[PDB]
Amino acid sequence: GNPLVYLDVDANGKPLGRVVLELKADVVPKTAENFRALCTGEKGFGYKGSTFHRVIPSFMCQAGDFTNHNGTGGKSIYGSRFPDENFTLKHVGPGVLSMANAGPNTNGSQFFICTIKTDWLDGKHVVFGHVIEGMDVVKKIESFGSKSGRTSKKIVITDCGQLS
Ligand SMILES: NCCOCCNC(=O)[C@@H]1CCNC(=O)/C=C/C(=O)N2CCC[C@H](C2)C(=O)N[C@@H](Cc2ccco2)C(=O)NCc2ccccc2CC(=O)N1
Numbered sequence: 001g002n003p004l005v006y007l008d009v010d011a012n013g014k015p016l017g018r019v020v021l022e023l024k025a026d027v028v029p030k031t032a033e034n035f036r037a038l039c040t041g042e043k044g045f046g047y048k049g050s051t052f053h054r055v056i057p058s059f060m061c062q063a064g065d066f067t068n069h070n071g072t073g074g075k076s077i078y079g080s081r082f083p084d085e086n087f088t089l090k091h092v093g094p095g096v097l098s099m100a101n102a103g104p105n106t107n108g109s110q111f112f113i114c115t116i117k118t119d120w121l122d123g124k125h126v127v128f129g130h131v132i133e134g135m136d137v138v139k140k141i142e143s144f145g146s147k148s149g150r151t152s153k154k155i156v157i158t159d160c161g162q163l164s
Pocket of ligand 1: 073
């Protein structure tokens with residue numbers, strides 16, 4: 001019964017394809033529900049039109065700051081921040097979907113998709129899903145990043161929603 005959601009991504013207006021994500025509501029229901037609702041936009045806000053603002057090759061692709069588009073913003077469906085739900089799931093390799101944060105219990109809407117095993121984040125960021133389809137799209141996104149995280153193209157979530 002875990003939901004499937006999708007992000008359609010383009011770079012400087014050129015479509016990259018669709019990333020499909022399974023959300024592990026069986027393990028982190030509160031975190032999964034937040035992401036699902038931000039994909040559908042059913043609360044009146046969410047990810048559509050927001051960007052991957054920080055992309056670091058051989059690390060991760062970060063997105064979801066739909067208020068400030070720069071890593072300082074975002075908000076969850078519960079409020080501006082909500083706590084770390086649990087650290088049961090681990091950053092085991094590429095395709096892991098995990099919450100960005102600025103310290104303990106600062107989850108909002110920002111998230112990242114790993115391109116390697118980021119196991120030093122275990123117990124520090126809440127893992128809540130993984131890529132079902134479209135790792136090749138993620139690798140395309142990654143190819144527009146840099147060591148600093150600055151991107152070389154504008155990477156936009158042109159559509160998102162829930163598949164099941
Ligand atoms: N650069 C070349 C060096 O390469 C080595 C690899 N670098 C690493 O491992 C680095 C090493 C240490 N730097 C950082 O923490 C970068 C901080 C950074 O950018 N700020 C600008 C934006 C506002 C501040 C500060 C912030 O903190 N905003 C949140 C996003 C967020 C806000 C509210 C909820 O969520 C964020 O962005 N958290 C960072 C993040 C996000 C996702 C996954 C992991 C991590 C840890 C990480 O990236 N750690």
